Structures are given as C-alpha cells and as structure tokens.
Design a protein around this nucleic acid. Structure first.
Ligand SMILES: O=C1NC(=O)c2c1c1c3ccc(O)cc3[nH]c1c1c2c2ccc(O)cc2n1C1O[C@H](CO)[C@@H](O)[C@H](O)[C@H]1O
Length: 565
DNA sequence: AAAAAGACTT
DNA sequence: GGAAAAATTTTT
DNA sequence: AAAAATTTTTCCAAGTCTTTTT
C-alpha cells in the first residue's frame, strides 16, 4: 500500500502521537558458559571462575588481539570493575590483572568465530529464518493508525567501554540491562507489554510529549539510552524535513547575517566582539558550536565556543598569503581539524585581544558559550541554532557544485562521478576526515589491473577496426561496409566500459581520506539529489541505496526536476 | 540564571 | 555513521 | 571448489539543544 505521511496535515506542536503499542524490547542473549576444556589460569595454576567474573573475563579475552588492552586506563578501569564482580574467595587470590592468563579463552573465541564461517547451508538458513521472525514480532510498533518500523529493538549486550580517543572511563564494564532498568512508553488504550517471566519493568509511562518507546540509564556516563523509530517513520521524517526547511529559512537572510557579524568585529563591547568571530568560524570554516563538557568524564575534545588558547596559533605571512590562522585541535569523536586559513584584517587583530594576558590552558572565548551564542541566533531568526549553519553551508554547496560538475553530454556513470565529486566537496568542508583502511588500500593494484586489462581488449578492438578499413581498399561492397559498422560499434562499447572503470577508480583514490556518509544522510537536503536525478534522467536507485531510499521517501515522491534549495 | 536532566541529532 | 563483521559475490 | 574483493547488517558513542530541577 505505502503510506504517504508527507501529504497529511502537519502534527500540532506539543503532541507527538495519540496511540502507541509495542511488544517492548528484546534482551541481549544470555551468557553461554566456557566448556570444561577451556581454562583460565592465574599465577600458572588453574582457576575455575564464577559465572559473574568469568563473564567479564570473556569480555577482556575477546579484545586480547587489540592494542588498547595494554593501556594503563583500560587495564586500571577494567580490573576495578572486575574485582567487584568477583566472589569473596576470588577477591582474595586475584590481586592483579597482569598475573592472569586469558590465552586459552582468547584462542577458543578465535576458534568459534572460525567455526561459524564453516557452518553448513542448512544451519545458516535456520538462524536467518528465526532472526526474521524476531524482526516481525518485536521489530515494528503501532503509532497512530499505521505500522512503523523500530530502530534498535535489541538492547546492547554487556561488554567493555572504549569509546573514542583518550577516554577516562575506557575499560569499564557496561552492566547488563535487566527489565527492572527499563522504562516503557505506550498509550493508555494500548496493550502494555509483558516483561520476561518473573520480572517487572521499572516504570510504565504514557508520555505523548516524547518520541521514544523504551528508555533506560547506562552505567558508564549515566546518560539515557533510547529505542526510537526507524528513519522511514513519520516522527523521524517530519522532523528531518523541518530541519532542511529551516536551512532554507536561513538562506533568504544568510547574507544579511554574514554582513552583520562583519560590522560587529568593529563593535564597542568585548562580548559582542567575541560572539561575532565565533559565528565566522562556524559559518565559513565549519566548526561545531562547542558545548562545555565535564572534565574527567569524557575525552578532551573541543569545538568553537569551547576552543582554548593552545588550540590556535597566529602567523602573519605563511607561504605567500597575509593573516594566517593555524588550527590544531581534536573535534567531535577525536577527529583532528588542521587548517591554515587567510582571514580578514579585523579578525587576526581581534584574536590577539582574546589571547592577551591568558595562559594556554584557558578558554579563548570567555564571556561566551553555546547558550549565549544561541540566544543571539534566536533574535536573528526564529528557530535558528548553531547547527543550521552546517546544514545550510552543506546543502547549498552541494547544489552549487552539481550545477558545475554535470555536463549535459556525459553518459550515466560519468554523471554519478560528478555527484560523488560534489558530495566529496561537502565532506572536506564539514570535516568528515577518515584514516585509510589497514592494508585494504593495496587492492588498488587489483582495481588498476582491471583497467589495464580493458586496455588489452581495446588494443585488439582498435586493431580490428584497422582490418575493416584496410579491407575496404581491396573489394568495396555491402559485405565489407558492414565490417566498418560492426567493428566500430564494438570499439565504442568497450571504450565506454574503460571510461566507467576509470570513473569509478578516481572515486576511490580521492575519497580515501574522507567520508560522504554523514553529510549524505544528515546535512544534504535529499530533494537536491532527487531534482538532480530527475533532471539528468539518472535513476535514484544508483545514488540512494535500500535504506536511504526509505528514509528519504518524502523527497523521492514530492520533488520535481525544478527544486531549488 | 546555572547546574543537572532528558530528548533527539550526527 | 564510521569501523568491524557477517552474508554475498567476483576472482581464482 | 577455495582464496579473495565487494556489499550490507550489527557494533559502539559523542555531540547539539531543549527542558527540568536546584
Ligand atoms: O555517527 C555516529 N557515531 C556513533 O557512534 C553513532 C552514530 C549514529 C548516527 C549518525 C547519523 C544518523 O543519522 C543516525 C545515527 N545513529 C548513530 C548511532 C551511533 C551509535 C553508537 C553507539 C551505540 O550504541 C548506538 C548508536 N547509534 C544509533 O542512533 C540512535 C542512538 O540513540 C538510535 O536510533 C540507535 O542506537 C542507533 O541507530
């Protein structure tokens, strides 16, 4: 049938749903104990571990081939949380982690992973079918007259935290979520889910002000984790559309604001002069608005409104250009932003006033935060917040670059290269850097020998064409004229295959150190892509995959070739 | 306000 | 949503 | 067949921003 929610009357602000019914969450598979043959050693003597401690042991044993299991924090934190999980007799023997031997456990787990790849077709088909019924019983929920798919109905299995970068809590045990940790959300008129036999849920609420189905607190940072609906849903979609419409509401007066902060660099007060240079960095240079986070709980990473004096270095003339600012800091997910950038005169002179009488450990932009920045952005435009500047700047840049890289005479695969090249341009700006895959980028040798193999085929096609024109000299008739037709059609068809493999090769080389993914899903308006695909006749299925085609369903229907962001 | 929470992004 | 796995696929 | 490159689920957190409590 297919529900077109985008044609319906917008949902009144306040309420998110009227009805909500779901079979609750699926719990993480229980611990399957280690057999009599797999032994844990301590001080070279055998030790049978109690089911609680043996479970945490398995969590360290599996990551043993990694490099972080030698880090001080990972080992301190781990051993702390492991000592808790032990019995009073084990706490007395096991004084340190360094005298423990996990090798037999680690080998068993490297053996089971290997034994799972050698599993028979009859067995694999049995797991894949009982996995697809789990998806039909717990995978969907009812939300207002329609069935909507759930995002992550499965609850996270217990293991060890690593997080990203230099984390202070890395190594800590993520404890198993029991039904008693779960808060349920459904309507009054709905069938409240039944908890696992001989268990009870923490609290069953009916909050129609919220979009979640199940929620709970996780022990590492204490933040609330949620079971939300799949992107194809109304609730996640109507909001994603709204986002991209508030990026357009910025476009019609962006130049007005971009020519306001410029004059504010010459302002009277210090607070007004800081807020303006901050806004410049977010807009033109693409920085996330740095929210102040607690120290010693998360990694030391910053953003704009949280940048420190040590993070930026000033240089007058570097390699030929005036007023250069050198950025060197770890952003979200510990990803480094290195940027040497020629700015205006009044900016470079302003940064000196901010770094005046301050130490390297102090915050560059004092008398400012994200809330002080956002209050001004609300009085500049309704709904405007600091992240709309990444959405706008990304979406507009995708449109400008497509209007430049799409040649009307190009064939279909070459047009795709253009969209990727334009996607790439947005990935570099919005800082979605990546590290080259370990030993997998050497398979570039195997992709080039597919292009050099097609040249071997064309070096026989061009020399097959030369036997069509050299035989036209001796006896020219209707049978010899067909050899100049059939052996010219082949040269053109093998040449369009070499072009296709040279197009798809330039993609992988230039897109080595960046990622299109984040931008594609969360920053680029899909209507810009659909308009493009309808304009050049390129089928959408060649740009958007199975998942994204369902997420952006609203853009695939409602959007003509004439859409202008 | 000004932390501390809770809800959605990315 | 990127990085690692697993369910598929193309080269061997 | 059986090693190997490409493709799609399943692991794992870290931000932005609004809403409570203190
Ligand atoms: O960029 C990301 N880095 C991440 O580590 C990440 C990201 C995204 C993400 C980026 C763009 C986007 O559009 C959606 C997205 N969902 C993410 C992550 C996670 C993520 C990480 C750990 C985890 O346990 C659940 C997660 N979900 C998930 O996102 C939500 C977290 O509450 C849930 O819907 C569910 O856990 C699962 O989908």
């Amino acid at each position: 049938q297919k529900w077109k929610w985008w044609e319906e009357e917008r949902y009144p602000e306040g309420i998110k749903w009227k009805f909500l019914e779901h079979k609750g969450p699926v719990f993480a598979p229980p611990y399957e104990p280690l057999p009599e043959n797999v032994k844990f050693y301590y001080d070279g003597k055998v030790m049978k571990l109690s089911p609680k401690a043996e479970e945490v042991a398995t969590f360290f044993a599996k990551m043993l081939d990694h490099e972080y299991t030698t880090k001080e924090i990972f080992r301190k934190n781990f051993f702390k949380d492991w000592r808790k999980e032990m019995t009073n007799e084990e706490k007395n023997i096991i004084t340190n982690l360094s005298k423990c031997d996990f090798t037999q456990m680690s080998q068993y787990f490297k053996a089971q992973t290997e034994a799972r790849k050698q599993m028979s077709k009859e067995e694999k088909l049995k797991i894949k079918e009982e996995n697809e019924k789990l998806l039909k019983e717990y995978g969907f929920c009812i939300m207002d007259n329609h069935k909507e798919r759930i995002a992550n109905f499965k609850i996270e299995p217990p293991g060890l935290f690593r997080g990203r970068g230099n984390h202070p809590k890395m190594g800590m045990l993520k404890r198993r979520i029991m039904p008693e940790d779960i808060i349920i959300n459904c309507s009054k008129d709905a069938k409240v889910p039944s908890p696992p036999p001989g268990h009870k849920w923490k609290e069953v609420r009916h909050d129609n002000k919220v979009t979640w189905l199940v929620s709970w607190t996780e022990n590492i940072q204490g933040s609330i984790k949620y079971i939300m609906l799949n992107p194809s849903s109304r609730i996640k979609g109507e909001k994603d559309w709204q986002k991209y419409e508030t990026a357009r509401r910025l476009k019609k007066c962006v130049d007005k604001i971009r020519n306001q902060y410029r004059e504010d660099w010459k302002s009277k007060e210090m607070k007004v002069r800081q807020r303006a240079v901050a806004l410049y960095f977010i807009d033109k240079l693409a920085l996330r608005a740095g929210n102040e986070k607690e120290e010693g709980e998360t990694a030391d990473t910053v953003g704009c409104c949280s940048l420190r004096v040590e993070h930026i270095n000033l240089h007058p003339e570097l390699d030929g250009q005036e007023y250069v600012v050198e950025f060197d800091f770890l952003g979200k997910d510990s990803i480094r932003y290195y940027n040497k950038v020629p700015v205006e005169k009044r900016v470079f002179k302003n940064l000196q006033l901010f770094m005046e009488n301050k130490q390297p450990e102090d915050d560059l932009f004092d008398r400012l935060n994200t809330g002080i920045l956002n209050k001004h952005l609300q009085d500049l435009m309704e709904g405007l917040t600091a992240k709309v500047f990444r959405t706008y700047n990304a979406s507009i840049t995708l449109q400008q670059q497509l209007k430049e890289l799409t040649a009307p005479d190009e064939n279909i695969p070459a047009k795709i290269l253009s969209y990727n090249r334009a996607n790439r341009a947005v990935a570099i700006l919005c800082n979605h850097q990546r590290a080259p895959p370990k030993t997998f980028e050497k398979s570039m040798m195997n992709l080039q020998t597919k292009i050099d193999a097609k040249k071997e085929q064309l070096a026989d096609a061009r020399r097959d064409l030369k036997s069509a024109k050299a035989d036209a000299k001796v006896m020219k008739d209707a049978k010899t004229k067909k050899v100049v037709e059939s052996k010219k059609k082949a040269v053109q068809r093998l040449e369009e295959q070499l072009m296709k493999l040279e197009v798809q090769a330039t993609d992988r080389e230039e897109n080595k150190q960046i990622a299109l993914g984040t931008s594609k899903l969360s920053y680029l308006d899909p209507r810009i892509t659909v308009a493009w695909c309808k304009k050049w006749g390129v089928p959408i299925e060649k740009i958007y995959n199975k998942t994204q085609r369902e997420k952006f369903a609203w853009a695939i229907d409602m959007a003509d070739e004439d859409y202008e962001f």
